[PDB]
Design an enzyme around this catalytic site. Structure first.
Site, PDB file in Angstrom:
ATOM      1  N   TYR A   1       1.890  18.517  32.470  1.00 41.37           N
ATOM      2  CA  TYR A   1       2.798  19.484  33.094  1.00 41.37           C
ATOM      3  C   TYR A   1       2.409  20.910  33.199  1.00 41.37           C
ATOM      4  O   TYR A   1       2.415  21.552  34.211  1.00 41.37           O
ATOM      5  CB  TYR A   1       4.279  19.093  32.674  1.00 41.37           C
ATOM      6  CG  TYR A   1       5.323  20.151  33.388  1.00 41.37           C
ATOM      7  CD1 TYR A   1       5.587  21.447  33.195  1.00 41.37           C
ATOM      8  CD2 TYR A   1       6.073  19.533  34.492  1.00 41.37           C
ATOM      9  CE1 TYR A   1       6.690  22.014  33.796  1.00 41.37           C
ATOM     10  CE2 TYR A   1       6.861  20.228  35.123  1.00 41.37           C
ATOM     11  CZ  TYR A   1       7.228  21.465  34.845  1.00 41.37           C
ATOM     12  OH  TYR A   1       8.144  22.377  35.349  1.00 41.37           O
TER      13      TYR A   1
ATOM     14  N   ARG B   1       5.689  22.260  41.635  1.00 42.71           N
ATOM     15  CA  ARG B   1       5.509  21.044  40.845  1.00 42.71           C
ATOM     16  C   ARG B   1       6.871  20.121  40.680  1.00 42.71           C
ATOM     17  O   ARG B   1       6.993  19.007  40.845  1.00 42.71           O
ATOM     18  CB  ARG B   1       5.187  21.395  39.164  1.00 42.71           C
ATOM     19  CG  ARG B   1       5.197  20.256  38.340  1.00 42.71           C
ATOM     20  CD  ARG B   1       4.250  19.115  38.886  1.00 42.71           C
ATOM     21  NE  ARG B   1       4.535  17.823  37.774  1.00 42.71           N
ATOM     22  CZ  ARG B   1       3.441  17.573  37.023  1.00 42.71           C
ATOM     23  NH1 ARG B   1       2.170  18.005  36.627  1.00 42.71           N
ATOM     24  NH2 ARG B   1       3.799  16.469  35.875  1.00 42.71           N
ATOM     25  N   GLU B   2       8.145  20.966  40.595  1.00 41.38           N
ATOM     26  CA  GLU B   2       9.262  20.481  40.430  1.00 41.38           C
ATOM     27  C   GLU B   2      10.055  19.850  41.951  1.00 41.38           C
ATOM     28  O   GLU B   2      10.586  18.738  41.888  1.00 41.38           O
ATOM     29  CB  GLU B   2      10.497  21.275  40.108  1.00 41.38           C
ATOM     30  CG  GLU B   2      10.162  21.733  38.573  1.00 41.38           C
ATOM     31  CD  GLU B   2      10.616  20.484  37.669  1.00 41.38           C
ATOM     32  OE1 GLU B   2      11.307  19.565  37.881  1.00 41.38           O
ATOM     33  OE2 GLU B   2       9.900  20.320  36.437  1.00 41.38           O
ATOM     34  N   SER B   3       9.925  20.447  42.989  1.00 37.06           N
ATOM     35  CA  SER B   3      10.440  20.066  44.237  1.00 37.06           C
ATOM     36  C   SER B   3       9.502  20.271  45.502  1.00 37.06           C
ATOM     37  O   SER B   3      10.165  20.226  46.693  1.00 37.06           O
ATOM     38  CB  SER B   3      11.656  20.900  44.417  1.00 37.06           C
ATOM     39  OG  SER B   3      11.592  22.152  44.766  1.00 37.06           O
TER      40      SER B   3
END
Length: 185
Positions: free
Chosen positions: A169, A72-74
């Site tokens: 999220y 999700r982040e990168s």
């Protein structure tokens, strides 16, 4: 041991909102969208599998959860420029924010992953104290939601993600994690 804070397979999830799915080129949203995006990151993710499993064992957190967060982040590093997010604030696979914590280690190593995971376990511990009535698995979801928007944004179980990026999220991360659970993590 990796079950100290719960098991991701027991968490109810509605997956990626359309705000997360559409920019990724999918025409559908939800759990199937989260799993397809997680599958796209699997090859890149496998490059760090040994480190992810090692940190998970060390901190007693599921490697699957660390992988869902990294996806999700990168996108497992595919979206970073020398470890930096596109606004220059987030550092590493797990995107620790330089304005909140001084980043440690190289952008894709054990030190970085240990720092991001420790930040996650701190949020899980905060939700455990804030909602003692919730089950361990519910607190794990709250913890993941707080990793993006802060413990102050988690006011209930049902509406926790509203206010997080794309309002999905934890739901999205939990679904990606359930996929990694079935694929070696």
């Amino acid at each position: 041991r990796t079950d100290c804070y719960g098991n991701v397979n027991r968490i109810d999830t509605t997956g990626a909102s359309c705000k997360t799915a559409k920019p990724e080129g999918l025409s559908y949203c939800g759990v199937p969208a989260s799993k397809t995006i997680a599958e796209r990151d699997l090859k890149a993710m496998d490059r760090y599998k040994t480190i992810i499993k090692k940190v998970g064992e060390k901190l007693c957190v599921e490697p699957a959860v660390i992988a869902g967060i990294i996806s999700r982040e990168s996108h497992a590093g595919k979206v970073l420029k020398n470890g930096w997010g596109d606004r220059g604030n987030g550092f590493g696979l797990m995107q620790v924010d330089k304005r909140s914590h001084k980043p440690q280690g190289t952008w894709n190593g054990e030190v970085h992953i240990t720092q991001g995971t420790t930040i996650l376990t701190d949020f899980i511990k905060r939700i455990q104290k804030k909602f003692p009535s919730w089950t361990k698995d519910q607190q794990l979801k709250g913890g993941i939601s707080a990793y993006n928007a802060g413990a102050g944004n988690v006011r209930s179980y049902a509406r926790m993600d509203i206010g997080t990026t794309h309002d999905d999220y934890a739901n999205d991360v939990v679904a990606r994690a359930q996929y990694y659970k079935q694929h070696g993590y």
